[PDB]
Amino acid sequence: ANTFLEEVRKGNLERECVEETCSYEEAFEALESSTATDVFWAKYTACETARTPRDKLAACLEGNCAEGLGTNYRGHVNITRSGIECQLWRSRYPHKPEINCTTHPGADLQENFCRNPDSSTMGPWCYTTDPTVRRQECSIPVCGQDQVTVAMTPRSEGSSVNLSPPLEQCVPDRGQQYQGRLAVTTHGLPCLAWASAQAKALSKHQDFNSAVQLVENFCRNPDGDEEGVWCYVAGKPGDFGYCDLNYCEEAVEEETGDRAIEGRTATSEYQTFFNPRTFGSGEADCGLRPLFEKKSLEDKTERELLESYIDGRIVEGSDAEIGMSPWQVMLFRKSPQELLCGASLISDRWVLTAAHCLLYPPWDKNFTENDLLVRIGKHSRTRYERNIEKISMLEKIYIHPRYNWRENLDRDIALMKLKKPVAFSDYIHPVCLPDRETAASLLQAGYKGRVTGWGNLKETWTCNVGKGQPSVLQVVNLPIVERPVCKDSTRIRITDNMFCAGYKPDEGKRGDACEGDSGGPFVMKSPFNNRWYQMGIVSWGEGCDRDGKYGFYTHVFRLKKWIQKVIDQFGEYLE
Ligand SMILES: *[C@@H]1O[C@H](CO)[C@@H](O[C@@H]2O[C@H](CO)[C@@H](O)[C@H](O)[C@@H]2O)[C@H](O)[C@H]1NC(C)=O
Ligand SMILES: *[C@@H]1O[C@H](CO)[C@@H](O)[C@H](O)[C@H]1NC(C)=O
Ligand SMILES: [Mg+2]
Ligand SMILES: [Mg+2]
Ligand SMILES: [Mg+2]
Ligand SMILES: [Mg+2]
Ligand SMILES: [Mg+2]
Ligand SMILES: [Mg+2]
């Protein structure tokens, strides 16, 4: 209904098919459309208990009501029955759909609206954003009626006189300066006693500052980690999981307390905080690319690190240079052959990888020590490079029980273990890591963040037609973004736990904030030591899924002594 000629047949359609009735070969007569016959047919047959009349039908073909069960619906509402965002059809976050993003266009599986594209087992539905629950039915009215399918529930928010109420007030000095009486964890395990028969044994060479007593069995922090509190627990040689509590915003980006000049003459002003035997090497021998840093040759992207230099523009995807991201891991699948996720090479014998792409029972996923393999030093994802890469079998996984896929990616931080030692090389070289007093001072000055990969993050979350995975390694720069800026962009609640980093977005475009890999290298070159310190883990973000948004990455300056307690276990488990 737009031009003169094509509107003429509107009256023809109305008479024969609607009021009276029609068939396929009758329709193909004065309609003149080989494909559009089937669209009508799908919409017509969907009106099951809606043959006649026009007043009672009205909007069954117009697609804004629900009859019988309701396979006619094409209408426009963001939300479902309760109050949860309907996911976009051809997007796949959180839960991946059983019907794919190609086979069936009949019900028109695109954009953030409800449908019924197979058979109504309950009602017409959309996929939830809430990663706990799977599906939920949308309460559309009935054609030629005022009646609703399912009741509405808004889900309130409370504090003053709603909860209980509790008003406990803050904890300073990351749980060193605190006393209490707790007995709970994330999943829920009873904490063991310190002075009894399973704790006192494993304590014969490590750092202490005993300002406090040893208090019975409670979640404590003597060794002085910047995170929280944990207790010992039972099982098949059991692990340690952190007891969860509420915390205040410690301005890690703007730390308060009472052009600039460059450093150069210094090889390494590093901390030897671990003991290379169980933990393995790569504390001293890291952050020193043999091809760039040792030979002392600037890459192209060292002359454009400052936010001050040429103000700012949208920087396009890059084809990387030869061997300029030796820190890289490419985690595959055994049967069938399938690239899954990414990891960051941290030592000669440790693998910091993503946790989301590991344990996720909405995808049916308990693939453990047998069904995995990692590959280091890969430029061509397509080809095989027998020498400059090589194969690396896996050993035990370790969990960080704060890890909550169920809620909102709280700590996407886990660890793997290789069996052999990966030998060092001209192509292969692990990356270093900084602590609180080193990391926080870097982002006082406006220094960019680097990410490399192949867009593994992009492909794993959205089906997304237009652009695809290249053979060549990606590489890209990202400036810094303020705290309340990123907070007032999105309405959904976030924390300092993670952080925001992207460019100034467009109106009519996706953007270039969805590159890299999932659990890949987020690094930054040092101006002091001519070194490379890793300060990020790539997980899910609003920069990919949504438009007009920045990529969302996890912080890593916490959990320093978490690894120190893990390396104790490797010695006793063997033999
Ligand atoms: C449904 O989802 C829409 C996604 O774009 C949003 O609509 C917006 O509506 C506002 C009106 O204040 C416009 O300013 C804006 O251009 C956009 O169209 C919005 O998240 C949501 N809208 C409603 C009404 O629920
Ligand atoms: C995976 O399977 C093992 C084998 O029985 C089971 O014991 C375990 O509970 C599963 N893994 C996890 C993390 O629950
Ligand atoms: Mg008529
Ligand atoms: Mg006829
Ligand atoms: Mg005919
Ligand atoms: Mg005919
Ligand atoms: Mg006819
Ligand atoms: Mg004809």
Numbering used by the authors: 1 to 258, 266 to 582
Reproduce the article's own wording on this structure.
In this study, we report the characterization of the prothrombin mutant proTS101C/A470C (proTCC) in which kringle-1 is linked to the protease domain by an engineered disulfide bond. Overall, proTCC spans ~90 Å in length, with the N-terminal Gla-domain, kringle-1 and kringle-2 aligned on a common axis and the protease domain folded back onto kringle-1 in an interaction that buries ~1253 Å2 of accessible surface area. Tyr93 is located at the tip of loop 1 and inserts the aromatic side chain into a deep cavity of the protease domain where it engages Trp547. The rigidity of the closed form influences Lnk2 that appears in almost its entirety as judged by the presence of extra electron density map connecting the two kringles obtained from molecular replacement. In the distal segment of Lnk2, residues 158–165 form a short helix turn before connecting to residue Cys170 in kringle-2. Only one crystal from the same screen diffracted to higher resolution (4.1 Å) after growing for >2 months. For the structure at 4.1 Å resolution, twinned crystals belong to the space group P1 with cell dimensions a = 85.0 Å, b = 85.1 Å, c = 153.8 Å, α = 105.3°, β = 90.0° and γ = 90.1°, and the refinement was performed by twin laws. Structures at 6.0 Å and 4.1 Å resolution are superimposable.
The conversion of prothrombin (proT) to thrombin by the prothrombinase complex, composed of the enzyme factor Xa (fXa), the cofactor Va (fVa), Ca2+ and phospholipids, provides a biologically relevant example. Activation of prothrombin by prothrombinase involves cleavage at two distinct sites, Arg271 and Arg320, along two alternative pathways that generate the zymogen precursor prethrombin-2 and the active enzyme meizothrombin, respectively. The hypothesis becomes relevant in the context of the recent observation that prothrombin exists in equilibrium between “open” and “closed” conformations that differ ~50 Å in overall length and with the closed form being predominant in solution (80%).
